[PDB]
Amino acid sequence: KVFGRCELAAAMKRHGLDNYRGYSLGNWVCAAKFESNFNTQATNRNTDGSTDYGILQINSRWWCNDGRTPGSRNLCNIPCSALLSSDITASVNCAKKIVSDGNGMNAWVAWRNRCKGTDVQAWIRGCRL
Ligand SMILES: [Rh+]
Ligand SMILES: [Rh+]
Ligand SMILES: [Rh+]
Ligand SMILES: [Rh+]
């Protein structure tokens, strides 16, 4: 599924991400935009052989099992394919574990490089929330 910007903002807010670990909703929408362009089906291979999955590009090195990432962890207890659903529940609940792991949203290199320090409120401008 490719979400609309406000549609994704609303689903993220309903699933508890607005100010989760102090990250305003615009941070999560900004991260999703640069990670997946709001596409739940997005996949990208990492240089280490792991793969990033879904709207928040959650990796198989630590967070999910894709059956092909050797010496990796499954800390969200999910098949990576669950992260590609039209239903973002698995991505959101796994993102809450990631962002609590010590590095906050710096865990998302795209967030640090494209969202951190920017006017992220712009990502929810004009949405009914
Ligand atoms: Rh908020
Ligand atoms: Rh809010
Ligand atoms: Rh939902
Ligand atoms: Rh509201």
Swiss-Prot record:
Organ and tissue specificity: In the egg white and polymorphonuclear leukocytes.
GO BP annotations, alphabetical order: cell wall macromolecule catabolic process; defense response to bacterium; defense response to Gram-negative bacterium; defense response to Gram-positive bacterium; killing of cells of another organism
Reaction catalyzed: Hydrolysis of (1->4)-beta-linkages between N-acetylmuramic acid and N-acetyl-D-glucosamine residues in a peptidoglycan and between N-acetyl-D-glucosamine residues in chitodextrins
Location of the protein in the cell: Secreted
UniProtKB keywords: Allergen, Antimicrobial, Bacteriolytic enzyme, Disulfide bond, Glycosidase, Hydrolase, Secreted, Signal
GO MF: beta-N-acetylglucosaminidase activity; identical protein binding; lysozyme activity
EC number from the UniProt entry: 3.2.1.17
Residue positions binding substrate: 101
Superkingdom of origin organism: Eukaryota
Domain spans labelled C-type lysozyme: 1-129
GO CC list: cytoplasm; endoplasmic reticulum; extracellular space
Family from the record: Belongs to the glycosyl hydrolase 22 family.
Subunit structure: Monomer.
Note: Lysozyme C is capable of both hydrolysis and transglycosylation; it also shows a slight esterase activity. It acts rapidly on both peptide-substituted and unsubstituted peptidoglycan, and slowly on chitin oligosaccharides.
Physiological role: Lysozymes have primarily a bacteriolytic function; those in tissues and body fluids are associated with the monocyte-macrophage system and enhance the activity of immunoagents. Has bacteriolytic activity against M.luteus.
Name of this protein: Lysozyme C
UniProt organism field: Gallus gallus
High-level lineage: Eukaryota, Metazoa, Chordata, Craniata, Vertebrata
